[PDB]
Amino acid sequence: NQADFTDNAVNTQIRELNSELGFAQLLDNSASAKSLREGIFNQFRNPLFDQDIDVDDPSNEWVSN
Amino acid sequence: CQYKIYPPLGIARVGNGPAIKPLSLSTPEVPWAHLYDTNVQYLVTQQELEQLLEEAFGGNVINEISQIKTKKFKQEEIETITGLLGLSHLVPQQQLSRSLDNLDIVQQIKGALLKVLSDHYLHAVKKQAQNFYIYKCDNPVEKLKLTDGDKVTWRVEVANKKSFWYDYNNALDLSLHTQGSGNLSKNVSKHRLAPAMTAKRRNPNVITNSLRKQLVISSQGSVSSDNNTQVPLRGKFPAERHNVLQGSIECDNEGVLRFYAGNGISQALSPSSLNTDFADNSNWFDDICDGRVTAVVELKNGDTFEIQDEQSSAWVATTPPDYAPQIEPIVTMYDMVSGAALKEQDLDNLTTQFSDVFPILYRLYRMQWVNQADFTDNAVNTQIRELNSELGFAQLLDNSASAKSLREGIFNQFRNPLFDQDIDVDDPEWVSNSRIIPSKDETNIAAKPATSSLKLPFYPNDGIDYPGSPVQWFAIPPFMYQHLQNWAAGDFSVTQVEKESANTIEELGLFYSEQFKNSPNSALLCARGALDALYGGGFHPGVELTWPMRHNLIYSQNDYVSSVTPEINLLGLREFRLKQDLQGLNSPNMYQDFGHVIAVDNVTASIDPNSDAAWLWRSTPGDLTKWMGIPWQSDAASCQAVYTPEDFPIPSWWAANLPVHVLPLARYNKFKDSQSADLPEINGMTHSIAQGMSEETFEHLRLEQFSQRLDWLHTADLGFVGFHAEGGYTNGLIQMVSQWKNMAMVMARPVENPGSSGIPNVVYVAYSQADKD
Amino acid sequence: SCQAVYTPEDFPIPSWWAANLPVHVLPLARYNKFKDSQSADLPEINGMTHSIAQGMSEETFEHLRLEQFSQRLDWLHTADLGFVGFHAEGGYTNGLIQMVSQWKNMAMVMARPVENPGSSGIPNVVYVAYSQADKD
Amino acid sequence: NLSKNVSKHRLAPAMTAKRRNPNVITNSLRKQLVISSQGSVSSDNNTQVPLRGKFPANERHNVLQGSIECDNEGVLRFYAGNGISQALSPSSLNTDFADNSNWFDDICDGRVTAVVELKNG
Amino acid sequence: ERHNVLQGSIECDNEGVLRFYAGNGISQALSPSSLNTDFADNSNWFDDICDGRVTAVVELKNG
Ligand SMILES: [Mg+2]
C-alpha cells in the first residue's frame, strides 16, 4: 500500500528510529520517553469514534471534521 | 370558526404553457364534470394563441398602429410596440426584440409576434392551476363575498425538500405495526409481506444539517384583493446557483386565489450528472413544491379575521402533469382520505350503496384508453361491454337473489386487500401461488408454475420489490373491497331513479355526474375534486403524493359529513385538514431528519405525538413532496409497464395519469370519418378508394385503426429513435427530463357517425407531435 | 438488430427484414380470442365464458373478434430479451446479448384457420405467432 | 471489538437486505441454491476424496468444494476448491461488489468431526 | 437555443503589435444528455477552438 510506504508519518518515524539503532526507546515505559510514545499514539484513530467530530444539533448526530 | 379555505389540499400541476387563465387548466372542483367533454384542449392550441394575440391588439393599439406607421423599426418605436399589448410576461423582451427588426399595418406585426408565441407555447402542456376560496362558516355555507372596502390577502410559503430527504426504496408503513385501516390491511406488517427497507440520504456528500439546508428550495409570497398582479414563488438551488420557479400566485378582485405550478424544469448541477435512478438522483433539483396556504379577512369596518390554524388553513402541492385528465385512477387520493379514518376490523359496520361500488367498475372500464390489459385482456370490462350490448347494465344494480350469481361473478375476479388469498404458507411466510413479477436480477431456475388466476386489477403495488409476495400486485383498499363485498352479498341499496338510467355503464355514469354537478356543498365538492384526479396506490413512490397520505395521523381533522345527494352516497363528502406546523418555513422542525438512514423504527416512534419523531406528521413546507422521486421525470419515465415472462396482461403502474398504451391522433384520423364523407381524404384514404369498398370492409378498417394502441413511451424521442438507437429503460429516464413536455396528451374526441363500426361515440385520443399521422 | 428502425415520425414504423425476422406479429393469445364463432360448442369462447360470449349482441361479439385480431405484439417481446422484470433495462444491446440464447424461444408464425369468421372481417386463414410467452 | 457508541449514536446504521436470487420462491425451491457435499477419510488409506456438490442442487454444474486426505499418522489435510466461479447464463455479469444473482462459487465451510479407534476396541 | 462562442480576443498596442488570446475553453453539447463518449467524433457538441486568417494594413505618415 503506497500510503504506508510514503504517506505514513508513524512508519517514517519508525524508520528514523531504525536508522539510529534507537527503536528500543519505544519499549521505555519511563517519563523520559512519554512524549515519544504519546506522539505516535495520538495519530491513531479512537474506536470510540467520538474524536474529530462536531455534534450536529443536540437526536444527536456525530459529524466527522 | 368564522372563515375557512377550500380546498384543504389544493393540487396544481407543472406545465410549460403560460401561467395565465385563458391558456391554463383548473383543478377539478366538481368530480366527473368533464369526463366526456370532447372540446377539451389540454395542450396550447394555435387557435388560443391567435385569440390571445388579437385580444392584445384591441383598440386603441389599433390607433397606436397608425401613429407609428406614418411616424424597419428603431430601438424605441419597438420599445413601445411591446408593452402596448403587454407580452412582457409571456416571452423574453429580446425574443420579441428581433421578432420585428427581422422585418396590414398589423398582420406581419401579428404574424411575427404569433410565430414567436407559437415557437414558445404551441402544443405546450398547459398548467393545471388550483383555485383557493374563502368560505364563511357556521360549516361552509357560501364563499366569502367581498364588499367594497374589504380585501383578502393570501399568503403562501412553499418548499422543495427532495434533494434534502432520503432515498425512496419502498413505503415505510409496510412494516408499521397497526390494527389495520381502510387503506392497508394489518396482514401486510403482521405477516411481513413487503418489509420496509432502510433508506440513506440523498446527496449524502453534503454533511452537517446546516450545510444540508442548501439542498432545500423555498419561496413565499402574498397577493391581495386590491391587485391581480401575479407574483412568482422563486427560490434558489443551492439555497452557480440556479433560480427555481416553484409557482406563481394571483388574486382577483373577488378574493379567489389562483395557484400556478412551475414550468416543469428539472436540472443537475453538472451536465454529466444523469438521472439514471427511478427515484434517487443526487446533484438534481426540480421545481416541484408544496406548502402552506393562509389568508387574512379584512372587512370595511375594521374587523380582521386571520385564517391561520390547521382547522381553517389549507395546503398546496404541485405534481407531474395529468396526461389523461378525463381518465380517473381506480383508487384516488380522495379514496385514501376516506379510508384513512376507518379501522379495518370495524369494516363490517360500513354500509354500501351501489354508487359506492360503481366508481370502481367505471374507472376500471375507462382504463381501456390508457392501458392495453384494460382494452383487450380484462374479462370484467368485456362483460360490462356484453351487458352494455344488450342494455342490461341495470342487472348490476339488482340486490335480489336472482342477481347474486352475476354480482358474485364480477367480485370474485378482484384482488382481496387482505393479501391472504392465492398463497401457500411456507414453513409454518406467505408465498403467492399466482403470477409473480420477477426481479430483473435473473436466476436460470424454472419458475414455480402458478396455480391461481391473476386477480384484478393487473397493476403492480407497494411490494413490487419482493417476488412471490401477494403485495406485488395492487388491490383496491380494504374499505373499497368491503363495499364490493357487500354488493356481492346483496347488502346494498340503490334508488329506483338509478336503475332507470342504468342500461349501460355510460348512461349511469352520466347520471352520477349530474348528481355531482347539482349537489349544493360547493366547498366539500371542491375539496374532493382537488384529490379525485390524484393516484392512491400503488406507492412506489407514486405519481403525485405517497404513503404518508394514507394515514389518519397526517390529518388534524377527517370526518364523514354528508352524501353526494340525500339519496346517493357516491363514496361521500368529507371535511379534512392536514396537520400543520403553524410556523411554516420558520419552524424549528423545518430541517429535521433521522440521521444517516430512515427506517420504520423512525415511523413507529412518530406515532406517539410527544416523541421527538412526531414532527413527521406535522407538515412544514416541502414535507408532502419530499418523498417523491427527484427529478420527477425519472419516476414518470419509470411509471409504465412492468413486463412478466407471460406476455398478457401487461402490468401497468399508474396508467390513468401516466398512460402506457394510447390511441394516437394518427389512428383517430384513420377512423373518425364515415364512408359518405366527401373530402378528398377519408380516413387516410383517397375518396375513390374509400367509397369503392364495401361499407362492411370500410367500417372493418375503422375498427382496425381504432384498435392500434401505441406505447406511450414511443410518443416522443425517449432514446429509441434512430439507426441502432439503444432505447431501453435508462435512456427513457434521462430523456424524460426534456421530453416530458412532448409526451402524448390524451383528450376526449368525438366520432360523429360510428355507424356499425363498434367505435364509441366519444373516444380518448393521445396528442403528440410524433403521433400526428 | 433485424427489427424496427424508429423515425421521429411515429408511423409508418420502418422494418428491416420482417418477412423472415418479423417485427409485429399476431400472437396465439389473440388467436384464441377471435378464432371461435358465437355458436361454438366450448365452455370458453374467445376468452369469454359461454354465457357472456352468447349473451352479447352479434355486432358486439364480432367487433371484439376484430379488436383482438388487430392487437399486434412486438416480435422482440415474444421471449425474454432483457426487458422482463422489475426495473429491467431492455434496449437494443440487451436484445443482441439475449438473442444468443433466446433465438430458439422467439415466436414462430404459422397459418391457422378461422372456421366461421362471419361478418368479423377476419380472413379465413390467419398467420399466428407461437411462443411460450405469448400463448395466453 | 466494537464500541457501543456505534449503535448508540447511530454512526453507521445497519441496512435492510433483500434475498439473493429473489425470483426463486418458496423455501423448498430455494434449497437448490445451496451447494453441499461431504466425505470421509481414514488413516488406513491416503487416497484423496473430493467434496463435490452441484449447482443447482437436488443444466447442473459440478462444484468441487474441496478435497480431503489423511496420512497414516492421522493428520487430515483439507484442500479448498480450484477457484472456479460461474453464472448459469454467460450473460449474467457480476457487476455488484457482493450480490450477483445467477452466480455460484466454490467457496465453502462446514463441520469437521472424527472418530478415534484404538487397538483394545 | 443558440450559444455564444468566444473564439478569441484581439488587441493591438500603440506600437503596432497584435496580441491574440484564445477562448476560455468552454465546450458544450446542445442538450445536457448528449455525452462526449468518443475520443474524436461526438455529434451535438461544439467547442471554442478556432483558426483563421491574419492580415494587416500599414498606413504611414506620408499617406
Ligand atoms: Mg388521469
Distinctive features:
part of a larger assembly, 5 chains, 65 residues, alpha+beta, two-stranded antiparallel sheet, 3 helices, 2 strands, 37% helix, 12% strand, binds magnesium ion
Question: Can you tell me about this structure?
Answer:
This is part of a larger assembly, with five copies of chain A. Chain A is α+β, with helices and mostly antiparallel strands and 65 residues long. Chain A is 37% helix and 12% strand. A two-stranded antiparallel sheet of chain A has the order 1-2. The first copy, chain A, is elongated and about 50 Å long. Magnesium ion binds next to loops of chain B. Chain D: Residues 36-49 have a biased composition (Polar residues). Chain D: Residues 36-58 are annotated as: Disordered.
Name the bound molecules. Answer: magnesium ion
Distance between the termini of chain A: 25 Å
Helix segment tally of chain A: 3
Topology, number of strands of chain A: 2
Largest interface: B-C, 65 and 50 residues
Structural class of the secondary elements of chain A?
alpha+beta
C-alpha-based Rg of chain A, rounded? 17 Å
Q: Enumerate the strands of the largest sheet of chain A in spatial order, edge to edge or round the barrel.
A: 1-2
Q: How would you characterize the largest beta sheet of chain A?
A: 2 strands, antiparallel
Helix content of chain A: 25-40%
Question: Hey, roughly how much beta strand do the residues of chain A contain?
Answer: 5-15%
Order of helices and strands of chain A: HHHEE
* Oligomer status: part of a larger assembly
Give the CA-based shape of chain A.
elongated
